[model samples]
Target: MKLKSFGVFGNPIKHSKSPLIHNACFLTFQKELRFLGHYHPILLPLESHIKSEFLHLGLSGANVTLPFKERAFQVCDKIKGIALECGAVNTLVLENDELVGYNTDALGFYLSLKNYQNALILGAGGSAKALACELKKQGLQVSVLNRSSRGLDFFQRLGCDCFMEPPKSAFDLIINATSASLHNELPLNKEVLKGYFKEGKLAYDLAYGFLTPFLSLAKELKTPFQDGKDMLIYKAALSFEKFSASQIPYSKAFEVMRSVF
Candidate 1:
């Protein structure tokens, strides 16, 4: 088989590093030349309608982001594992002529968060749940603060404390996984970020490009935090494995992808 086609789908694609990170893993791929990136703006019919284009192209797979992921899940012919759990589709494959959606973000974040023993996760979306699950898997304590209460029990089982209100305590690490930063819209309880950045080791934002309004605040306050660039590279490595259909070595890609953003 040739290299399976893969790329990320997001509105503001100018800053996405999926192409950079995936290409860096060329050393371990089945076909080194087939990967590509496509920039799709989240402006009209909704991400639910984009899958038809993929079906027409006979694509191997694609990654979803922002306003699209959750909607993408609505059209999948079949869904499994973390993607179903995410209620969103950060990753998916065209398998047996069907769209199969899955999420690598939770596990992807787990690999990055392994070093920290605890975290203060912001947002209550699919991406946030992904990280929350991973942090709990690593034996770390986590608290989730969001207004949405529908999935509180699920996260609680994962050892997370759901906070619909502003955070009143500190954590070792703080993460912003909400899509609020993409359009300059901030998540609820966003002000708590200043305190978390002050007390935490990192206020990692899942959104990249220029620093989000939230991340900028963290930096201004002298918080030792980073944007999602690194995590994007890491997640690309995982997606590279899927695209290449092999466990490609990421050391070289790490060197190249490290410079991304």
Candidate 2:
């Protein structure tokens, strides 16, 4: 109605798939409405200004990614649903001149899995928080492994099996939620990976596009694996629905979003 503005906030924001997905969805609605998308790169020397500067611009809503998802959670006026449960906020909106936070990442990750019963999520960051909560709530047994213990208490209190070192258990699904793969880094020891990469199990990495060491290892072991592309599309469709305040058919939106990818 008012040239509704939307944006994604991140440090290395250039590579984000949200703008491509959301802007394409926006075109489907722009004929009868006013909407636009912006990519706000919260670059070096200005990380602290992420919240303040974004709020200053008065966007209708935004998706927060990477190093800023926790910060997005902290600055919101109200927390609801999965965002509250996970202590992370990957989606945000402005309501009555105040900030409100929600987490569609939970739903995205939940829907992305198929025929899964148990999971071992690598890394304990914002994405991991969202996935662990949703998988547990859906009655799937969940475990987490992290290099650092920071941001791990929530998963522990939720009764998730937590591990600092490699776990020997063979879970049905292995998810790499860490950004380590973004830099070609591996989050788990090769020996531990071997134990988890048994036949018929799926390996999913949340960082898409690149063949990270984690996915590379999965391939070497001949285990079926997938990158984050599907998760990104699913979540962006949800964000589009949130921003436009309409129940656009997810299948139709997904079709358009997938075409541009």
Candidate 3:
């Protein structure tokens, strides 16, 4: 059997755990799925053409991360599942030479979230867009807070209440979907976060592998918190299914990928 190629594409992608997580699953299930191949991180230039770069590398499937999910959605020959609702694509599979785009992040985040009624998501990026759509689908009240109004329109279109600054009301779930944590900054100031982070609230950061300031605030406020690790594993499990043509089940892939953390 010919080995298939897979990769995750993004700028500043060296920090990504997709290769580590996906390769572990491939290695564990190799005997059962012989055509499974190595996964790699492909750091792409900001201006590079996504479809052309994907085809040029002869990739069987690819994951698009920050700054590229929307671009990936634009280049796909067909958009399926939540990608259509979110207007972003995190997973891309090549079939009959056509790229099919899917948004696994929405489902992954939904799976990671614990019990919550009203949710507040910080940041208005692609991940925020996907989460808003999924949370609404689950019949939860969703609101988005961003430092700017640039990406707020998309969330508003999804029927999410948009805020330029943190709202006064307390939410059961608060998620940091912004890149602020990547820069060691809190998405909002300490005083503002203190108002939101209270007992019974869960603070979730989309950035994993480090103690981000957002998570730190949750700790200070004694609020329950979670990193992005579980969400990454779940989404990668779904991406693995697409890459392996479902020869590897999501639960199996998720179990193996979870072991790597």
The CA lDDT of each predicted structure is: 0.67, 0.79, 0.87
The parts of candidate 3 lying over 4 Å away from their true place are none
Question: What's the lDDT for residue 24 in model 3?
Answer: 91
Candidate 2 structure quality by residue, lDDT tens digits, 104-140: 8989877676568898988888899989989999888
List the candidate 1 regions with Cα displacement exceeding 4 Å: 1-5, 12-14, 20-44, 73-87, 113-115, 185-191, 247-256, 259-261
Q: Best by TM-score, which number?
A: 3
Candidate 3 lands at a TM-score of 0.96
For model 2 the local lDDT of residue 65 reads 88
- The model with the greater TM-score, 1 or 3, is 3
Residue 30 alpha-carbon offset, candidate 1, angstroms: 6.9
Q: What is candidate 2's CA lDDT for residue 251?
A: 65
Model 2 misses residue 84 by how many Å? 1.1
Q: In model 3, what is the error at residue 59, expressed in angstroms?
A: 0.4
Ranking by lDDT: 3, 2, 1
Model 1 scores a TM of 0.78
Worst 10 residues of 1 by lDDT: 36-45
* Residue pairs of candidate 1 with colliding backbone atoms: 83-103, 144-163, 145-163, 146-163
Q: State residue 111's C-alpha deviation in candidate 1, in Å.
A: 3.3
